[PDB]
Each structure stands twice: as C-alpha cells, then as structure tokens.
Write a protein that binds this ligand. Sequence first.
Ligand SMILES: O=c1cc[nH]c(=O)[nH]1
Ligand SMILES: O=c1cc[nH]c(=O)[nH]1
Ligand SMILES: [Cl-]
Ligand SMILES: [Cl-]
Length: 163
Amino acid sequence: GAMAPSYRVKRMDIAKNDEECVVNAANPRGLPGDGVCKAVYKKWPESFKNSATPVGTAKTVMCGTYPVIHAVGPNFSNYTESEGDRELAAAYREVAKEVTRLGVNSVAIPLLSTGVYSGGKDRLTQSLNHLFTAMDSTDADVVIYCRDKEWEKKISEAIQMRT
Ligand SMILES: O=c1cc[nH]c(=O)[nH]1
Ligand SMILES: O=c1cc[nH]c(=O)[nH]1
Ligand SMILES: [Cl-]
Ligand SMILES: [Cl-]
C-alpha cells in the first residue's frame, strides 16, 4: 500500500506515466483501437496477447513485469444511459480488484467511456464518480490522466473538494 493513499490528476499521455501499472481504456476485442488504447498499444504491444474481454470487465496482461489492466467501458452509442451506467460502474469495480490483486502501490488510470465511447456527451463527472466509488477502498496512489486543460481543472477541483 501507499503510506498516505492519494488521488492526483495529470494532463499528459498515460503511455508516459510514472506509476507501477496502467489501466487501458480497451475495446472488447483486444484491438489496437484509437485514442488512449492506441497509445497503450504503441508503448506495450506485448500486453495485447489474449487481452479480449467483455464490456464491464478488466483483464490484466504483463508487458515484461509491467501490468496493463485492460478495462472495457461501454460505448454509449450502443448502450442505453441506464445499462451503460451499470457497465461503466462495473468496469471500475473490476479495475479495483485487479489493482488489489497485483499488490501495486500506484496505478495510472484514464476516465473510461469519456472519449470515442461517450456517445458525444460530457461524462467527466459520471466516469470520475464511478472511479471514486471503486478505488476509494484501495490503498494504491491513483493518478488520473487526461488530455484537455478544462478537464484537468474540473478533475483537480473534484479531488480537492473531498480533502
Ligand atoms: O479503442 C478504444 C476503445 C475505447 N476507448 C479508447 O480510448 N479506445
Ligand atoms: O475530451 C476529453 C476526453 C477525455 N479526457 C480529456 O481530457 N478530454
Ligand atoms: Cl504528453
Ligand atoms: Cl472512451
């Protein structure tokens, strides 16, 4: 565990993280994909051996000794708001189980279903609150990675609100 488990946010490519493991915003088929998934494929392509896994689940594959946790959020283009919400919460609960099982002291995590799987909606608050529900009972240092300056400010504010 971390000495004083924390949440932080950074605005940069998750493929350059400084944590003991990474969460991929995966697709169910283990394909290179786009966005975070493509950056993860470039950096850790070995981790895509038998990484296919259903929506709402996480599957870890080692790249050397570095764990890549493939977390499959719902594509809100395909799911109803209600079913999508249930699967998005479930994907994060499976991430918390994997982070715990691995015994890591830190994890780099993107906001699932906020990019090409958002169904064109802003899901910062929805995705971040499911991340907190899952990760609050873990003792790993969590570092959330984002792209956009306005998202960094909103994520930082949500973290600081609780402290
Ligand atoms: O390929 C995919 C699927 C989900 N999320 C991404 O970032 N890329
Ligand atoms: O538009 C987006 C989606 C995810 N993360 C960001 O920082 N911006
Ligand atoms: Cl960067
Ligand atoms: Cl996404």
